[PDB]
């Protein structure tokens, strides 16, 4: 039977670590794929770590120039939560260079975007097969949210964007039932940019905290429900949470207007935020100009009242370790026996040519946390790889 | 309960990619079998990629001289769709250097030909054990279709040939129930050659588009039903689709006669074609004298009226990448919930000594596509291996 999610999000006080891949550390000798961005989705029986393999193994000579992030070789694979992305346990899901997956209660749905830059299209797998295809409409890079989709009452939703990166794009909300699409509406959000949302369900309303890549230090917010009626805005919090940002004491914040800054207009990073009443568990990097470190801030009334009062702070990566994307997902009732959904989030750690020049490859390692009612301290659970690898020499 | 297939083939407008092995690219460091020709068959629960391993791993020194395509070490193995042919997921199916497999609803049937050249015979596995043996009758190389067999109402069919390669052979149609053979009729096709058919069911009639190796540029057609009454002919299409062929404007075509050409008489390549009313989705290589590139042509009335009007064209490999065999298979109702069968086709990409002289080995990588009602663009999903490998140095 289909998986319900019309139940409220759980109030949590601190996040406790759940699993850690050790993907790069083991990969020095073991056969492990080269990943760029992973994410986690939970079905009724088990949670699985999806990732976009680059078609080559670490230390393999095919890892040359893996910084290239769109190629015909990329594929979305799947491994049970915690296990390294090794070559012999990874179940194949779809071909893609941008994807999303979620479990609707019966079988996995997975969306995989492929094709040329200007003529991309998306293939919607359901249970192992393609059932439908969605083509671009503005004929630029088509993109999905790089994290789990949200399924409620058997219908799974996700957000796609097509258009320029550093300028106003066209965003659409999709709705599907048993693989094939059934509804589609466009977001008329003139003043901002919504690229790489992270979504979770909350009492029948899908909420997404997204990435602003155009004249914005602030997280966009999208809220929609069964029949795709939506509200669009910005995370009111007075504490900025995008990677390029001015220090907290200089920022002002706004609920509806985008807020630019000094050199922070044309860049950003995927993030997440959980609403708790009117507060928000906004996650952000420690550094204000680079993807390093990571924090979780519980901002009182940060969802609606431009507040700056940080009630609680937790650090999971100290400032000297590289970080990356971060996304949200929820563990459903069928797996907890709770009467509410337990929030969780995942955090990747990039290592490679983008910041470590000498290496020829680029991979990342995933870490997963979940909320806990009891308060929990933090620690620097860094990846711990030791570069350069044998192939870089 | 046995798997029905007495339902019509589904009308499709374009083929969307489903999976890609990345076998060779991963094999540079991972432990992967050396393949020569793969194919795909779909059961009620999952689809699987079969392949005739050569009994050695890539980069292993045993890969010496793997061009030899019949030796006492080949074996038909099986992997779930999309996963690379690695050494540790691979289930073992049968010993063979020529094989076919299909799922009849209860358990996998698999046929494996083995033995010396002049006294070969076939073993019919059913559910992991042998039940019956079929011996040669003209005492030359015995061959099965190198692609999935067609099962209807529990009876599985396949085509075998024995005799010369460049001259008139003897062809037979087999029918089996729960492993053991029950019926057998010979095809009295005097004017042509039918070697390596690709078959799919269509509303109770098994249809096969085969390979002509003797005075033929044109695809032979075989149609038979429950009790093995058959009709034999040629694909009427005015567009030739065998590898050696004259350009389309010089060809004329015929429904019943073989059509030779200038130097195109004693060679060919396995291919496929799906009937859509009176049109055909004939697949063919891009080049007219080599196995490179790949196209899919929807020829209006090409099945019966010698037409040349190409309504739609799709390219999946540009002319600069090597290609190879191609075969058909259908995803049944049990796995789609549709009231019709969804056509699909697979395309291998050979790399090795046959055209790249310096390498000592020979392997191929599989790519799978499936039909979609919506129109879909094409792209060059090439294998992307980087030869020579470490063992060729």
């Amino acid at each position: 039977e289909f998986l319900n999610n019309t139940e409220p999000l759980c109030n949590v006080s601190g996040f406790a670590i759940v699993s850690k891949d050790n993907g790069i550390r083991i990969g020095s000798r073991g056969h492990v794929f080269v990943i760029r961005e992973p994410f986690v989705a939970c079905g009724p029986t088990e949670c699985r770590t999806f990732f976009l393999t680059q078609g080559a193994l670490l230390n393999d000579k095919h890892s040359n120039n893996t910084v290239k992030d769109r190629s015909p070789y990329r594929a979305l694979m799947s491994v049970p939560l915690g296990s390294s992305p090794n070559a012999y346990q990874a179940k194949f899901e779809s071909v893609a260079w941008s994807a999303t997956a979620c479990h609707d209660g019966k079988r996995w749905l997975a969306v995989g975007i492929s094709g040329a830059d200007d003529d991309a299209y998306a293939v919607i797998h359901y249970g192992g097969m393609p059932t439908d295809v969605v083509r671009s409409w503005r004929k630029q890079i088509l993109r999905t949210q790089e994290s789990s989709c949200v399924c409620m009452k058997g219908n799974c939703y996700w957000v796609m964007t097509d258009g320029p990166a550093n300028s106003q794009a066209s965003y659409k909300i999709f709705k599907s039932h048993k693989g094939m699409v059934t509804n589609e509406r466009e977001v008329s959000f003139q003043g901002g940019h919504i690229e790489e949302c992270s979504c979770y369900p909350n009492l029948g309303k899908v909420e997404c905290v997204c990435r602003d890549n155009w004249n914005g230090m602030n997280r966009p917010v999208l809220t929609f429900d069964e029949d795709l009626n939506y509200e669009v805005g910005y995370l009111c919090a007075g504490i900025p949470t995008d990677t390029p940002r001015v220090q907290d004491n200089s920022f002002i914040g706004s609920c509806t207007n985008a807020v630019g800054g000094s050199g922070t207009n044309n860049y950003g990073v995927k993030g997440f935020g959980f609403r708790q009443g009117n507060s928000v568990w906004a996650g952000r990097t420690v550094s204000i100009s680079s993807r390093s470190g990571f924090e979780i801030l519980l901002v009182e009334d940060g969802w609606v009242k431009t507040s700056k009062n940080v009630v609680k702070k937790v650090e999971v990566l100290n400032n000297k370790n590289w970080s990356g994307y971060s996304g949200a997902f929820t563990i459903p009732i069928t797996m907890t026996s709770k009467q509410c959904l337990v929030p969780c989030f995942w955090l990747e750690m990039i290592r490679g040519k983008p910041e470590e020049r000498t290496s020829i490859w680029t991979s990342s390692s995933s870490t997963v946390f979940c909320g806990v009612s009891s308060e929990v301290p933090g620690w620097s659970w860094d990846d711990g790889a030791i570069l350069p690898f044998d192939i870089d020499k | 309960e046995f798997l029905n297939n007495t339902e019509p083939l589904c009308n499709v407008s374009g083929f969307a990619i489903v999976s890609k092995d990345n076998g060779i690219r991963i094999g540079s460091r991972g432990h992967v079998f050396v393949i020569r020709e793969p194919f795909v068959a779909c059961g009620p629960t999952e689809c699987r990629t079969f392949f005739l391993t050569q009994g050695a791993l890539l980069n292993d020194k045993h890969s010496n001289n793997t061009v030899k395509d019949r030796s006492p070490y080949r074996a038909l193995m099986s992997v779930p769709l999309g996963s690379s042919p690695n050494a540790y997921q691979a289930k073992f199916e049968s010993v063979a250097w020529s094989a076919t497999a299909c799922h009849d609803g209860k358990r996998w049937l698999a046929v494996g030909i083995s033995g010396a050249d002049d006294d070969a015979y076939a073993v019919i596995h059913y559910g992991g054990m042998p039940t019956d043996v079929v011996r040669s009758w003209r005492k030359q190389i015995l061959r099965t279709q190198e692609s999935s067999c067609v099962c209807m109402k529990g009876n599985c069919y396949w085509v075998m040939t024995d005799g010369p390669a460049n001259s008139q052979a003897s062809y037979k149609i087999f029918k089996s129930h729960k492993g053991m053979v029950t019926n057998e009729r010979e095809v009295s096709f005097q004017g042509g050659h039918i070697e390596e058919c690709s078959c799919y069911p269509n509303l109770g009639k098994v249809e096969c588009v085969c390979r002509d190796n003797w005075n033929g540029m044109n695809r032979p057609v075989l149609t038979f039903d429950e009790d093995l009454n058959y009709e034999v002919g040629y694909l009427c299409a005015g567009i030739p689709t065998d590898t050696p062929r004259v350009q389309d404007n010089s060809f004329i075509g015929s429904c019943t006669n073989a059509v030779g050409g200038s130097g195109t008489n004693n060679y060919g390549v396995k291919g496929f074609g799906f009937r859509q009313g009176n049109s055909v989705w004939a697949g063919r290589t891009v080049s007219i004298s080599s196995r490179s590139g790949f196209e899919i042509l929807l020829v209006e009335d090409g099945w019966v009226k010698t037409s040349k009007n190409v309504v739609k064209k799709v390219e999946v490999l540009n002319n600069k990448n090597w290609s190879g065999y191609s075969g058909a298979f259908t995803i049944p109702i049990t796995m789609t919930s549709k009231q019709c069968l969804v056509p699909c086709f697979w395309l291998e990409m050979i790399r090795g000594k046959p055209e790249e002289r310096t390498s000592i080995w020979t392997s191929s990588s599989s790519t799978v596509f499936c039909g979609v009602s919506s129109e879909v663009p094409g792209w060059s999903w090439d294998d992307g291996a980087i030869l020579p490998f470490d063992i060729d140095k």
Epitope: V67, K68, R70, I141, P164, N166, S167, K353 | -
Partner: antibody
Framework: LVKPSETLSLTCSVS??????????WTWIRQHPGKGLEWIGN???????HYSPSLKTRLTISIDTSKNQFYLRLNSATAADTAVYYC???????????????????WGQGTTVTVSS | DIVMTQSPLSLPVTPGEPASISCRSS???????????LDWYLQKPGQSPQLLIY???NRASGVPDRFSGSGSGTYFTLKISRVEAEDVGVYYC?????????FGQGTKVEIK
């Protein structure tokens, strides 16, 4: 026509599309008689500019989003500056995590400039 | 700047036959972000240039299916599978790696 040592000015217009739509970089390209092409500079919808080093001291390029026009100014024009001038659009970006580039997909008709008395 | 050179100055061709043009650059055009920024442009008599190939291999929209491209590092190649009467013109290669974009010398295609 332009006399030597004067200041050259040119105008280019956009229609169908609107400046600040699609996030394109607008480019000026030059072609001397009998020679190959040469690249002058770029302007983004928001006014950020790039110049070719050899002409950086003479050039000035700007936009007027209300008129859907962008302009080229070249000071101290020499006789050698005689050439055909094209204006084109090119949409590309290098910051984001999904870069793209569609080089110079649209060109306007050339304008012949002769620097002589 | 990237010094760009082009192999044939003039390429005699005839309809129906394959044809090839090549370019070499003084520095590898493999940008740090992994993409290879090189294009090919075609200028027919009495017209402003047109876009053929906008990266090492990608064809532009509307271009005839007869064109192709390949190459990496410093050496690149444009391939015409079947030359036709409409292909007469001057072919320029371009690179978009560095701040100053530079074009090639220009290979003229003359039918024979």
């Amino acid at each position: 026509l332009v006399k030597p040592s004067e200041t050259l000015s040119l105008t280019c217009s956009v229609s169908g599309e609107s400046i600040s739509s699609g996030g394109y970089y607008w480019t000026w390209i030059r072609q001397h008689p009998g020679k190959g092409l040469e690249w002058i500079g770029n302007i983004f919808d928001t006014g950020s500019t790039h110049y070719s080093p050899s002409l950086k001291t003479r050039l000035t390029i700007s936009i007027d989003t209300s008129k859907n026009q962008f302009y080229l100014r070249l000071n101290s024009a020499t006789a050698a500056d005689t050439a055909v001038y094209y204006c084109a659009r090119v949409g590309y970006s290098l910051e984001t995590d999904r870069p793209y580039y569609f080089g110079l997909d649209v060109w306007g008709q050339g304008t012949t400039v002769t620097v002589s008395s | 700047d990237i010094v760009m050179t082009q192999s044939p100055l003039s390429l005699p061709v005839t309809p129906g036959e394959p044809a090839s043009i090549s370019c070499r650059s003084s520095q590898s055009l493999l940008h740090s972000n992994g993409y290879t920024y090189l294009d090919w442009y075609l200028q027919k008599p009495g017209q402003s240039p047109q876009l053929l190939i906008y990266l090492a291999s990608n064809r532009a929209s509307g271009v005839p299916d007869r064109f192709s491209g390949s190459g990496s590092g410093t050496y690149f190649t444009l391939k015409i599978s079947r030359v036709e009467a409409e292909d007469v013109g001057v072919y320029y290669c371009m690179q978009a790696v560095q701040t100053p974009w530079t074009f090639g010398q220009g290979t003229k295609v003359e039918i024979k």
